[PDB]
Design an enzyme around this catalytic site. Structure first.
Site, PDB file in Angstrom:
ATOM      1  N   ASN A  46       0.691  -1.164   0.158  1.00  0.00           N
ATOM      2  CA  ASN A  46      -0.114  -0.179  -0.097  1.00  0.00           C
ATOM      3  C   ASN A  46       0.948   1.173   0.136  1.00  0.00           C
ATOM      4  O   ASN A  46       1.504   1.508   0.991  1.00  0.00           O
ATOM      5  CB  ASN A  46      -1.053   0.124   1.261  1.00  0.00           C
ATOM      6  CG  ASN A  46      -1.788  -1.170   1.258  1.00  0.00           C
ATOM      7  OD1 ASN A  46      -2.468  -1.633   0.277  1.00  0.00           O
ATOM      8  ND2 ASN A  46      -1.450  -2.104   2.240  1.00  0.00           N
ATOM      9  N   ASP A  53       0.099  -5.919   3.000  1.00  0.00           N
ATOM     10  CA  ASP A  53      -1.044  -6.965   3.532  1.00  0.00           C
ATOM     11  C   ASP A  53      -0.312  -8.492   3.140  1.00  0.00           C
ATOM     12  O   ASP A  53       0.203  -8.530   2.106  1.00  0.00           O
ATOM     13  CB  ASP A  53      -2.172  -6.812   2.556  1.00  0.00           C
ATOM     14  CG  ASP A  53      -2.899  -5.511   2.808  1.00  0.00           C
ATOM     15  OD1 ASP A  53      -2.718  -4.914   4.167  1.00  0.00           O
ATOM     16  OD2 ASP A  53      -3.351  -4.671   2.007  1.00  0.00           O
ATOM     17  N   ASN A  60      -2.816  -6.737   7.551  1.00  0.00           N
ATOM     18  CA  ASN A  60      -1.780  -5.776   7.473  1.00  0.00           C
ATOM     19  C   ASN A  60      -0.719  -5.550   8.476  1.00  0.00           C
ATOM     20  O   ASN A  60      -1.068  -5.697   9.717  1.00  0.00           O
ATOM     21  CB  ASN A  60      -2.648  -4.408   7.480  1.00  0.00           C
ATOM     22  CG  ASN A  60      -1.979  -3.208   7.086  1.00  0.00           C
ATOM     23  OD1 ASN A  60      -1.734  -2.443   7.639  1.00  0.00           O
ATOM     24  ND2 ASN A  60      -1.949  -2.976   5.554  1.00  0.00           N
TER      25      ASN A  60
END
Length: 130
Positions: A46, A53, A60
């Site tokens: 991300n 993840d 996460n």
């Protein structure tokens, strides 16, 4: 490893996920489908917030496992993120149980809301013998 539908259905049952904290098996299946396609080795970076993840449930690194590289994170499940990339899902299951033990429950995964909430999810376990 990429699980087949029923094979994972059976595995999760054995692992005690059916009805865990009020969450039906079919819901956990819907989750895994949408998060990893049932792939235990899946990872997603991300860029937005610098976290990753990991595994079948796309857990996460900001809060649940330690990767060393995510800023300001915690490791609630007491595991290295590496543990969630094994072909065996014992660690993933124990961590996912931990996640839902917090108030949000299954809602902690936004894909569950988008893809599984209020839908007929029976299809995910049909014909699997669970």
């Amino acid at each position: 490893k990429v699980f087949e539908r029923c094979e994972l259905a059976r595995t999760l049952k054995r692992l005690g996920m059916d009805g865990y904290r009020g969450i039906s098996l079919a819901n956990w299946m819907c989750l895994a489908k949408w998060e990893s396609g049932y792939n235990t080795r899946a990872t997603n970076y991300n860029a937005g917030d610098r976290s990753t993840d990991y595994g079948i449930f796309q857990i996460n690194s900001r809060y649940w496992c330690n990767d060393g590289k995510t800023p300001g994170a915690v490791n609630a499940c007491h595991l290295s993120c590496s543990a969630l990339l094994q072909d065996n899902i014992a660690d993933d299951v124990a961590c996912a149980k931990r996640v839902v033990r917090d108030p949000q429950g299954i809602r902690a995964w936004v894909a569950w809301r988008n893809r599984c909430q209020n839908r007929d999810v029976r299809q995910y376990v049909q014909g699997c013998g669970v």
